[PDB]
């Protein structure tokens, strides 16, 4: 079997088994959203 992936800016359709944690806003944290992972401060936003 050949699995061909695409990792677009589009809704996640298949995911790995990671357990999910609560949001931690206004602190510098490691984060991972749908595998997009980085470090920074999370806040609400006005963005459309």
């Amino acid at each position: 079997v050949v699995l061909s992936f695409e990792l677009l800016n589009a809704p996640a359709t298949v995911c790995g088994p990671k357990l999910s944690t609560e949001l931690v806003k206004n602190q510098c944290v490691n984060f991972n959203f749908n595998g997009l992972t980085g470090t920074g401060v999370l806040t609400d936003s006005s963005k459309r």
């Binding site: 980085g38 470090t39 920074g40």
Partner: protein
């Protein structure tokens, strides 16, 4: 002509504007933040430079 001269009979006071740059914007770069962002892993590789 070898025997005539022009002499100014009058004058003008002139004011002229000369514009000169003297400074530029002082700039500062956080070389770690520019290269690595906040990622710890890249900052460890950057130490090897």
């Amino acid at each position: 002509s070898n025997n005539t001269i022009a002499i100014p009979t009058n004058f003008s006071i002139s004011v002229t504007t000369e514009v000169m740059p003297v400074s530029m914007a002082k700039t500062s770069v956080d070389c770690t933040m520019y290269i690595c962002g906040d990622s710890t892993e890249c900052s460890n590789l950057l130490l090897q430079y």
